[PDB]
Amino acid sequence: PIVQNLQGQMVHQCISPRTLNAWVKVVEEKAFSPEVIPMFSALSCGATPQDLNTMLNTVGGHQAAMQMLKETINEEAAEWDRLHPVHAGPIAPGQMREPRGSDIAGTTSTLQEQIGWMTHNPPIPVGEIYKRWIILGLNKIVRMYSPTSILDIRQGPKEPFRDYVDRFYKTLRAEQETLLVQNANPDCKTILKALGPGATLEEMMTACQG
Amino acid sequence: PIVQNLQGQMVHQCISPRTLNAWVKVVEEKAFSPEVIPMFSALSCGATPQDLNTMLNTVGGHQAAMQMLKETINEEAAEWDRLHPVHAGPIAPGQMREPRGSDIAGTTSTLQEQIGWMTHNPPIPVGEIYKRWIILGLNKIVRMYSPTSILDIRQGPKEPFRDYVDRFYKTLRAEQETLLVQNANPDCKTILKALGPGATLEEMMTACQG
Amino acid sequence: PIVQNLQGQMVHQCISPRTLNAWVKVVEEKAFSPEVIPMFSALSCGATPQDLNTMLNTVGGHQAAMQMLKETINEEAAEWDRLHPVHAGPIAPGQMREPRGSDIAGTTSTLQEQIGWMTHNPPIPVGEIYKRWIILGLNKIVRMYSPTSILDIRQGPKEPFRDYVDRFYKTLRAEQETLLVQNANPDCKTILKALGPGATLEEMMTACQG
Amino acid sequence: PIVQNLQGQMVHQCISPRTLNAWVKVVEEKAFSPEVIPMFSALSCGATPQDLNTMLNTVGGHQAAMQMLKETINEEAAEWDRLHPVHAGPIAPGQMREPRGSDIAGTTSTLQEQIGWMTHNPPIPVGEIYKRWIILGLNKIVRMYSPTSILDIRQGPKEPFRDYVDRFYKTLRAEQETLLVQNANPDCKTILKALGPGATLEEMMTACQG
Amino acid sequence: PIVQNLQGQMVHQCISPRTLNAWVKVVEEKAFSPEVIPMFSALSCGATPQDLNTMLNTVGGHQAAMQMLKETINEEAAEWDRLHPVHAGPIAPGQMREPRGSDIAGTTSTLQEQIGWMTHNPPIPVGEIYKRWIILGLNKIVRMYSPTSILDIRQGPKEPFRDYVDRFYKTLRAEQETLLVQNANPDCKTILKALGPGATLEEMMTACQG
Amino acid sequence: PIVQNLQGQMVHQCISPRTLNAWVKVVEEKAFSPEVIPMFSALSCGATPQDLNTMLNTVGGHQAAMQMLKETINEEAAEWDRLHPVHAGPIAPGQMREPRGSDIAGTTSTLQEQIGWMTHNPPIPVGEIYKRWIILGLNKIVRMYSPTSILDIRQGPKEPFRDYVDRFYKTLRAEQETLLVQNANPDCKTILKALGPGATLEEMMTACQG
Ligand SMILES: Cn1nc(NS(C)(=O)=O)c2c(Cl)ccc(-n3c([C@H](Cc4cc(F)cc(F)c4)NC(=O)Cn4nc(C(F)(F)F)c5c4CCC=C5)nc4ncccc4c3=O)c21
Ligand SMILES: Cn1nc(NS(C)(=O)=O)c2c(Cl)ccc(-n3c([C@H](Cc4cc(F)cc(F)c4)NC(=O)Cn4nc(C(F)(F)F)c5c4CCC=C5)nc4ncccc4c3=O)c21
Ligand SMILES: Cn1nc(NS(C)(=O)=O)c2c(Cl)ccc(-n3c([C@H](Cc4cc(F)cc(F)c4)NC(=O)Cn4nc(C(F)(F)F)c5c4CCC=C5)nc4ncccc4c3=O)c21
Ligand SMILES: Cn1nc(NS(C)(=O)=O)c2c(Cl)ccc(-n3c([C@H](Cc4cc(F)cc(F)c4)NC(=O)Cn4nc(C(F)(F)F)c5c4CCC=C5)nc4ncccc4c3=O)c21
Ligand SMILES: Cn1nc(NS(C)(=O)=O)c2c(Cl)ccc(-n3c([C@H](Cc4cc(F)cc(F)c4)NC(=O)Cn4nc(C(F)(F)F)c5c4CCC=C5)nc4ncccc4c3=O)c21
Ligand SMILES: Cn1nc(NS(C)(=O)=O)c2c(Cl)ccc(-n3c([C@H](Cc4cc(F)cc(F)c4)NC(=O)Cn4nc(C(F)(F)F)c5c4CCC=C5)nc4ncccc4c3=O)c21
Ligand SMILES: [Cl-]
Ligand SMILES: [Cl-]
Ligand SMILES: [Cl-]
Ligand SMILES: [Cl-]
Ligand SMILES: [Cl-]
Ligand SMILES: [Cl-]
Ligand SMILES: [Cl-]
Ligand SMILES: [Cl-]
Ligand SMILES: [Cl-]
Ligand SMILES: [Cl-]
Ligand SMILES: [Cl-]
Ligand SMILES: [Cl-]
Ligand SMILES: [Cl-]
Ligand SMILES: [Cl-]
Ligand SMILES: [Cl-]
Ligand SMILES: [Cl-]
Ligand SMILES: [Cl-]
Ligand SMILES: [Cl-]
Ligand SMILES: [Cl-]
Ligand SMILES: [Cl-]
Ligand SMILES: [Cl-]
Ligand SMILES: [Cl-]
Ligand SMILES: [Cl-]
Ligand SMILES: [Cl-]
Ligand SMILES: [Cl-]
Ligand SMILES: [Cl-]
Ligand SMILES: [Cl-]
Ligand SMILES: [Cl-]
Ligand SMILES: [Cl-]
Ligand SMILES: [Cl-]
Ligand SMILES: [Cl-]
Ligand SMILES: [Cl-]
Ligand SMILES: [Cl-]
Ligand SMILES: [Cl-]
Ligand SMILES: [Cl-]
Ligand SMILES: [Cl-]
Ligand SMILES: [Cl-]
Ligand SMILES: [Cl-]
Ligand SMILES: [Cl-]
Ligand SMILES: [Cl-]
Ligand SMILES: [Cl-]
Ligand SMILES: [Cl-]
């Protein structure tokens, strides 16, 4: 990634073995759960487009999702070229050429060019633009691999209300208020209807404790 | 987080994979025990609002508690806007705009803005203000998930006094003096009543050793 | 490797025990899966030819592949000498001699010479030239050890379409569009034929969900 | 803690996840064995009063001992106020207010104030003063939880003298010379009595080897 | 070891616990396999003669090999004194005395003297000279503990050619072309004889795939 | 320990949790094997007398040996006072008082005084003087706990000569040439007697391979 060192300058440093291993392990253990996306954004802090492709390439398996990640990046890269056409001409000394979509994705750009774009003044955050494309495609993967719909998360007759709300918002996070009340069991729904329409979650959970 | 480097300046650095993993593991192993709150405050030392949302997002499951954490942050953010209304006008060069409640929560604020607020002179510790909101909501979660009341922690007839005091103050910490004497078994309560009302814990524990 | 320190200068530092262990473990666990190649490129970030030979030497076993890696490096080193003949003459003060193929492979070159080449102005990235030779030979090993052909990856009658696409592009990555449709089961192929020839993968996967 | 950086100045840095985990694990595995006290003093090297409360708060369970640690800190803090009464008056620029007992314990003091006290010239080591209070209370816990008295550590008829001396000074360390000779078995005590009253331990152990 | 810090100067730093543990573990797990030698050279990067003796001393067991390592170092140290006799005389200020064989082995030399030799201008790499002696003796140990001769590595009638070449060059690496063809089974040797005398390994392996 | 930072000055830094854990684990797993002594010397690189007492205090159990370590340190400290009597008088500004035996052992000396002694010009290496006392006492512990004598290490009738030499020099290292030949079995001793009195170990091991 690009990290500010002891001085104020932004400089490139190699991706650490801990970062490489942490990203590989979180995909092996949690696949494409919703919490894998913010873990990816944190492990790729300040990452160059080369570092982003490194993390995505180290993932063995799940190639159906990774191929869908290819098509999404290609769609976003094509829209970038539609909105930012590169103007031909010799690049002035001390300046950088305009990045294309494939340049932001690290396909037609070198590490030196990515360092120049990200450390420019003003900078061209090609790493954050690429990560924004990857996270978008990763969110489409999480929604596609979401197994349960929010309409099928109903509280059991003996299920504690806390455990049911855990399953409700867990499914809601993968799929990306009153339905929570409607899907409760008859005993708790009677309690929640007498509580008022403007109750908080900690008020609803406290009312249906057992 | 924002860490003072070799020079005196405060600069941003990426959250480490060790910090990300340490927070995820402590929630998997201890859930919402009282000691998870100070562990969260230590792992989020100098954290920006972005780093705080990162730690809260990496938590898979327990979404009922995390959704209650949303409503608490929204309540504290709304009170911040009620006490600190943003005055319109162009921001002077070298200055930062006034943060709103959602800006402190990292919702409508960029990392660059959070760096400017936290490294300002004088600084606006939006990270510590946000963490103070999160810890408050986390304390409400610990009290809600506290299983046992302090009134039901009584010493057994054969239970050693040390083990009973362990259960007493463990429950007392989750729920957030004379009751300790009252809930002791008849043999130790006779000893403690003859010891005096101003005895220390190490004096009470020494008196009921067996 | 060669890492820019606190100052702007590029300086040599020893390869870390974490990097040594991470490369040995990834070969023990995944052998020559496609994702081992980008893991090798990331762990050898900024590596000198000496560090590259170190990583390749620490691999115990798989010597059939490592010997094929020798012949590939020898072929690329011989082509380098054919395109870059060293011109005889005394080396001027502050300058470096022209590297041969065996010099880039770290065979006839010292660490001091590799530091001088990589930190020259302009630099001679003998480490990146050598790594480009190693990755090329490693790609030939992955293709040789690829067990299944893409023609034999067909969807089962009861196999979910997601799992089949996982096996399809996993094999496709090792071997290095319409065939994916042709190798599907009759039920999904009927669905995909009525979808159109320009469908995306997430559209094809959504159409054959079961 | 407060660590001298590259320059000569003392600056604050966040407590590391390794330090947090090392202290939690050593209490889970060894509870209040005598060697836990020096482990606590080493892990809290240069720690601020905030870092000390962090380590003590991350301990789950053993709340009977931790509550006794509260009363000891309160006793030492009350004695500090009895010996160092704070004199009222406006604090001069560049100076710090006089710390109270609760200020040294991190109860009524901010991290900024603790940084100012510990980095003052001359410094006020509120962290070392607080740690001296904690270690004192921790030593009272070790002595209270010491199970065996030194009077009951006697050498068995077939017990090797080395193993018996191991149990002797292990108990002696928890409880905090001739008794070692008296508590030996008749065979070794006959040997030690003929050795002289001024024998060393390695001389006594060598004399009773079997 | 001696590592260049933030400035250009070479300075001594303590050997890390990770380096100490990594060397002890690799000897416990792989003993004296050929890949242990380059692992030793990498873990001892920039090591002083004191650090080299530290790594060799931390090895418990295998003392027969370590004693053979003593005699080899003594032989190389005696040859160094035969080629570099120390000339008597007072050492000038800012200069270092000429190292003997036992000085390079860290036997009659202090750490301060080793720092002065390795950081001299021009430097006397006593650490690299000592490591060159140790690696030479370690190579004699690997050849002595090599169990199988290359003449006894023959391909089985049903053994895949890939697995046989793995055993061939594994044995060849421990012992330190046409024989590979001769030791193949009759079916593959017929294929290799019709392939030509100038075939590569990947051509020979491809020809005998089954 | 005292480590040279980015500048040339020697400064104190806290002992790392990895160093604390590495020393505790090596005593739990290997007790007082000979290789524990050089592991202690490496982990205590640049350690102050306070850090040395920290490592020795974190050892739980083995108190018989640790108490023998007390008496040895007391003997060496008493000899230091006999050879270096402290001359009374006011200490000049910028100077340090003469250390006593208990000052070198960290008993009557503060960390600030130990920093002043070790960073003086010229320095007083009280840490290396103390470590030299500890290693001496640790060597007496290894010899006392050495179970087998070198006279009882004889080669079995069917024992391979390599395994027997492993047991020979392993015992020889704990206890601290021709005997190796005498203690061999009759078959190998006949071979070694016909080899000559000036044979090396690798020659003797090669001659008795089976
Ligand atoms: C090659 N490249 N081409 C693209 N677009 S394109 C013409 O339409 O195909 C494409 C795009 Cl859009 C984005 C980036 C890459 N990029 C990759 C990518 C990363 C990546 C992106 C993902 F979104 C998901 C990933 F997991 C990895 N790695 C690969 O794709 C490796 N891979 N190979 C094959 C196969 F063998 F089947 F072809 C398959 C894969 C993974 C996906 C399924 C099959 N690595 C690199 N390393 C070194 C140097 C440059 C690059 C690089 O620039 C791009
Ligand atoms: C999105 N946002 N919106 C809010 N308030 S609001 C209109 O009323 O809803 C809200 C508030 Cl108050 C605080 C912060 C966030 N914030 C989050 C939050 C963090 C967070 C806060 C918690 F207090 C508890 C957490 F675990 C995580 N992450 C999410 O909330 C992710 N999430 N999504 C859904 C669902 F899919 F169900 F919608 C659910 C969750 C977790 C809780 C239960 C369901 N991440 C971010 N990352 C990247 C960039 C910005 C942001 C961000 O600004 C805020
Ligand atoms: C010695 N050298 N010679 C070559 N070309 S050449 C005349 O034709 O043979 C050759 C080439 Cl092309 C590339 C680099 C090396 N290089 C190696 C190589 C690395 C390497 C390259 C690979 F591509 C695969 C690897 F795993 C390791 N290590 C070895 O080869 C060790 N090894 N030994 C034997 C055997 F004993 F069988 F001979 C075998 C091996 C491994 C492969 C199978 C057998 N390490 C070194 N360390 C210290 C100092 C210099 C060097 C070094 O310069 C070169
Ligand atoms: C709150 N505070 N108050 C005190 N003195 S006082 C009026 O008489 O009670 C007291 C004293 Cl003397 C010392 C320090 C604290 N301090 C603690 C303490 C640390 C601590 C000290 C110990 F010596 C042992 C510990 F483990 C932890 N943490 C707590 O005490 C948490 N806790 N809560 C309860 C309960 F819920 F039961 F109340 C219990 C505990 C732990 C002990 C048993 C019950 N953390 C903090 N974090 C953030 C900011 C400030 C602070 C803080 O200033 C002080
Ligand atoms: C003592 N010294 N003497 C030598 N040459 S000499 C007169 O002929 O014997 C000799 C040589 Cl040539 C090389 C270096 C050492 N050196 C060792 C050596 C390292 C070493 C070298 C190896 F090549 C293999 C190793 F594993 C370790 N450590 C030891 O040897 C410890 N050891 N002790 C005994 C025994 F007890 F049996 F005597 C045995 C061993 C290990 C080998 C088998 C028995 N450590 C040290 N630490 C602190 C300070 C200085 C030194 C040191 O200078 C030298
Ligand atoms: C206290 N002190 N006194 C000594 N000499 S003296 C009057 O004759 O007794 C003595 C000497 Cl010579 C050397 C150093 C210490 N030193 C220790 C020592 C370290 C140490 C040295 C060893 F060589 C072996 C060790 F493991 C630890 N720690 C202890 O001894 C703790 N301990 N306590 C008891 C008991 F409870 F039984 F008393 C026992 C032990 C361990 C040994 C067996 C019993 N830590 C400290 N921490 C904080 C601050 C100062 C100090 C300290 O200065 C010295
Ligand atoms: Cl790392
Ligand atoms: Cl995976
Ligand atoms: Cl794959
Ligand atoms: Cl831009
Ligand atoms: Cl369901
Ligand atoms: Cl419930
Ligand atoms: Cl569910
Ligand atoms: Cl990390
Ligand atoms: Cl969890
Ligand atoms: Cl979730
Ligand atoms: Cl403010
Ligand atoms: Cl109960
Ligand atoms: Cl009790
Ligand atoms: Cl309970
Ligand atoms: Cl490391
Ligand atoms: Cl392997
Ligand atoms: Cl091998
Ligand atoms: Cl070039
Ligand atoms: Cl198949
Ligand atoms: Cl499916
Ligand atoms: Cl398959
Ligand atoms: Cl850490
Ligand atoms: Cl615990
Ligand atoms: Cl608790
Ligand atoms: Cl003071
Ligand atoms: Cl007992
Ligand atoms: Cl004994
Ligand atoms: Cl006992
Ligand atoms: Cl380390
Ligand atoms: Cl071993
Ligand atoms: Cl040994
Ligand atoms: Cl030389
Ligand atoms: Cl064989
Ligand atoms: Cl094969
Ligand atoms: Cl074999
Ligand atoms: Cl550490
Ligand atoms: Cl132990
Ligand atoms: Cl103990
Ligand atoms: Cl001295
Ligand atoms: Cl024996
Ligand atoms: Cl043998
Ligand atoms: Cl034995």
B166, B52 contact by CB (below 8 A): no
F142 burial (CB, 10 Å; 0-12 / 13-18 / 19+) is: buried
User: Cα-flanking dihedrals φ and ψ of residue B110, to 5°?
Assistant: -85, 165
Ligand nearest to the CA of D169: 6
**Distance from C-alpha of A9 to C-alpha of E92, rounded to nearest angstrom:** 44
Helix (H) or strand (E) holding A18: helix A17-30
- Residue A65's contacts (CB-CB under 8 Å, 6 or more residues apart) are A32, A141, A144, A145
Q: Which of C2, C68, C70, C72 to mutate to test the interface with E (most CBs of E within 10 A)?
A: C68
What is the CA(A59)–ligand 9 centre distance, in A? 7
Instruction: Choose among E14, E58, E67: nearest Cβ to F35.
Output: E58
D50 in Cβ contact with D111 (< 8 Å): yes
Instruction: Count the alpha carbons within 13 Å of C115 in the hemisphere toward its beta carbon.
Output: 14
Residue C139's contacts (CB-CB under 8 Å, 6 or more residues apart) are: C37, C176
Is-contact F1 F47, C-beta < 8 A?
A: yes
Contacts of E5 in chain F (CB under 8 A): 4-6
Decide yes or no: CATH 1.10.375.10 for domain C2-145. yes
Residue E2 is classified by DSSP as E
The count of other CB atoms within 10 Å of the CB of residue F91 is 9
User: Would you call the peptide bond into C49 cis, given omega within 30 degrees of 0 as the criterion?
Assistant: no
Say yes or no for a CB contact (<8 Å) between D58 and B42: yes
Closest CA to F60 of B97, D185, B200, D37: D37
Q: For residues B21 and B28, is the Cβ–Cβ distance under 8 A?
A: no
Find the C128 Cα to ligand 7 centroid distance in Å.
Answer: 21
Residues in contact with B76: Cβ distance below 8 Å, sequence separation at least 6, in sequence order: B101, B133, B136, B137
CA distance B185 to E87: 87
| Angstrom distance (rounded) from CA C164 to CA E16 | 48
Task: Report the separation in Å between the CA atom of C63 and the middle of ligand 22, taken as the mean of its atom positions.
Answer: 9
- Separation CA A28–CA F206 (nearest Å): 50
Is A13 touching C (CB cutoff 8 A)?
A: yes
If one residue of C70, C126, C132 were mutated to test the ligand 3 pocket, choosing by the most ligand atoms within 8 A of its CB, it would be: C70
Cβ of A205 within 8 Å of Cβ of B144? The answer is yes
F204, amino acid identity:
M
Using DSSP bridges, classify how beta strands F10-12 and B2-4 pair: parallel, antiparallel or unpaired. unpaired
C80 touches C72 (CB < 8 A): no
Q: Is residue C4 within a helix (H) or strand (E), and if so which, with residue range?
A: strand C2-4
D58 touches chain B (CB under 8 A): yes
Q: Angle, to 10 degrees, between the axis of helix E17-30 and the axis of helix E49-57?
A: 50
Q: How many CB pairs lie under 8 A apart between chains A and B?
A: 80
DSSP per residue, C34-53: TTHHHHHHHHTTT--HHHHH
Question: Locate tokens 């998997």: which residue?
Answer: B28
Q: Which technique?
A: X-ray
List of residues 6+ apart from C114 with CB closer than 8 A: C48, C49, C50, C106, C126, C127
> After which residues does chain F show a gap where C to N exceeds 2.5 Å?
176
User: Position of tokens 């962290």?
Assistant: D127
Q: How far is CA D86 from CA D89, D123, E164, in A?
A: 9, 17, 84
F73 lines ligand 6 (CB under 6 A): yes
Ligand 27 centre distance from Cα of residue C201 (Å): 19
For chain C, first and last CA: distance in Å?
A: 51
DSSP H helical segments within E31-160, as ranges?
36-43, 49-57, 63-83, 101-104, 111-118, 126-144
Distance from CA of E136 to the nearest CA of F (A): 14
Lookup result for tokens 């920290």: F54
Beta-carbon separation of A68 and C201 below 8 A: yes
D121-130 long-range contacts, CB within 8 A, separation 24+: D123/D10, D124/D96, D124/D99, D126/D48, D126/D49, D126/D99, D127/D1, D127/D2, D127/D44, D127/D46, D127/D47, D127/D48, D127/D49, D127/D51, D127/D52, D129/D80, D129/D104, D130/D49, D130/D52, D130/D73, D130/D104, D130/D105, D130/D106
Contact across the interface for A64 and C169, Cβ inside 8 Å: yes
φ, ψ at D39 (rounded to 5°) = -65, -35
Q: How far apart are CA D115 and CA D12, in angstroms?
A: 7
Reading the block at residue C166, the tokens are 């996982």
Answer for the pair C135, C110: CB distance below 8 angstroms, yes or no: no
Is the CB of residue A78 less than 8 Å away from at least one CB of chain B? no
If you take atom 2 of ligand 5, which residue's CA is the nearest one? Answer: E107
Token code pair at residue A113: 């060019």
Contact criterion met (CB < 8 Å) for A4 and B12: yes
User: What's the gap in Å between B205 CA and the centre of ligand 18?
Assistant: 21
What is the DSSP secondary structure assignment for residue A3, as one 8-state letter?
A: E
Interface size between A and C, measured as CB pairs under 8 A = 80
Question: What DSSP state is assigned to residue C99?
Answer: P
The whole-angstrom separation of Cα B173 and Cα B148 is: 11
Alpha carbons within 13 A on the beta-carbon side of F101? 18
Q: Cβ of C26: how many Cβ atoms within 10 Å?
A: 21
**Chain A residues with CB inside 8 Å of B48's CB?**
none
Kindly state the tokens that stand for A148: 């349960």
Q: Of B188, B20, D161, E172, nearest to F65 (Cα)?
A: D161
Between A36-43 and A126-144, two packed helices, what is the crossing angle to 10 degrees? 160
- In angstroms, what is the C-alpha Rg of chain F? 23
Q: CB distance F68–D38 less than 8 Å?
A: no
Return d(Cα E81, Cα E70) in angstroms, integer: 17
Q: Which amino acid is at B23?
A: W
Rounded to an integer, what distance in angstroms lies between the CA atom of residue F13 and that of residue C140?
50
**Which pair of tokens denotes residue D46?**
């240069």
First to last CA, chain B: 51
CB B210 within 8 A of CB B193: no
Query: Going along chain D, which residue ranges are E strands?
Result: 2-4, 10-12
Q: How far is the CA of B128 from the centre of ligand 4 (A)?
A: 20
Minimum CA distance residue for ligand 5 atom 45: E53
User: What CA–CA distance (Å, rounded) separates F80 from F109?
Assistant: 15
Q: Cα distance from B169 to chain D (closest Cα, Å)?
A: 6
Q: Which residue's CA is the nearest one to ligand 5's atom 46? A: E53
| Angstrom distance (rounded) from CA F205 to CA B25 | 53
B135 CB within 6 A, ligand 2: no
**Beta strand pairing call for D10-12 and E10-12:** unpaired
E57–F43 CB contact, under 8 Å = no
Query: Which one-letter amino acid corresponds to residue F76?
Result: E
CB contact under 8 A, C4 and A21: no
Residue of E nearest to F165 (CA): E64
Ion ligand 18 residue ranges (Cβ < 5 Å): B 148, 152
Nearest to A169 among B11, B14, B64 (CB): B64
| CB-CB neighbors (< 8 A) of F166 in chain E | 61-64
Residues belonging to chain D: 210
Report the amino acid identity of residue E125: P
Angstrom resolution of this structure: 2.4
Return d(Cα D135, Cα D131) in angstroms, integer: 6
Check CB contact under 8 Å for C42 and A54: yes
Q: Which residue has the tokens 């055993």?
A: E167
* Residue A172, ligand 2, Cβ within 6 A: yes
Partner C, chain E 183-202, Cβ-Cβ below 8 Å = 200-202
Ligand located closest to A30 CA: 8
Put simply, whether A59 touches C (Cβ < 8 Å) is yes
Residue given tokens 């990290």 in the structure block: A3
Q: Determine the residue of chain B that is closest to D2 in CA distance.
A: B4
Question: Ligand 25 centroid vs E166 CA: distance in angstroms?
Answer: 25
Given CA atoms A109, A112, A118, A120 in this order, what sign does their dihedral have? negative
| Residue numbers in A near C35 (CB within 8 A) | 57-60
Ligand 48 centroid–CA F80 distance in Å is 39
Task: Please enumerate in sequence order all residues whose Cβ is within 8 A of that of E138, keeping only pairs 6 or more positions apart, or say none.
Answer: E32, E36, E37, E40, E69
Q: Nearest-CA distance from C3 to chain A in Å?
A: 7
Asked if B10 reaches chain A (Cβ–Cβ under 8 Å), the answer is no
Contact C35 A140 (CB under 8 A): no
Pick from B145, B137, B67, B142: which is nearest to A169 by CA?
A: B67
B35·D58 Cβ contact <8 A: yes
Q: Do A64 and C1 touch (CB under 8 A)?
A: no
Instruction: Tell which phi-psi region holds residue B105, choosing left (phi > 0), alpha (psi between -120 and 50) or beta.
Output: alpha
> For strand C2-4 and strand B2-4, is the pairing parallel, antiparallel, or unpaired?
unpaired
- Three state DSSP letters for B122-178: CCCCHHHHHHHHHHHHHHHHHHHCCCCCHHHCCCCCCCCHHHHHHHHHHHHHHHCCH
Does the CB of E148 have a partner CB in chain F at under 8 Å? no
Helix and strand tally (H, E) in chain F? Answer: 11, 2
Separation CA F67–CA C100 (nearest Å): 63
Task: State both tokens at E71.
Answer: 């005699």
Q: Per the CB < 8 Å rule, is E162 touching C18?
A: no
Neighbours of A113 (CB within 10 A): 18
Q: How close B6 gets to chain A, by Cα (Å)?
A: 6
Q: Which two tokens stand for residue F79?
A: 């000899």
Tokens 């399809």 belong to residue: C168
Q: Is B54 on the interface with A (CB under 8 A)?
A: yes
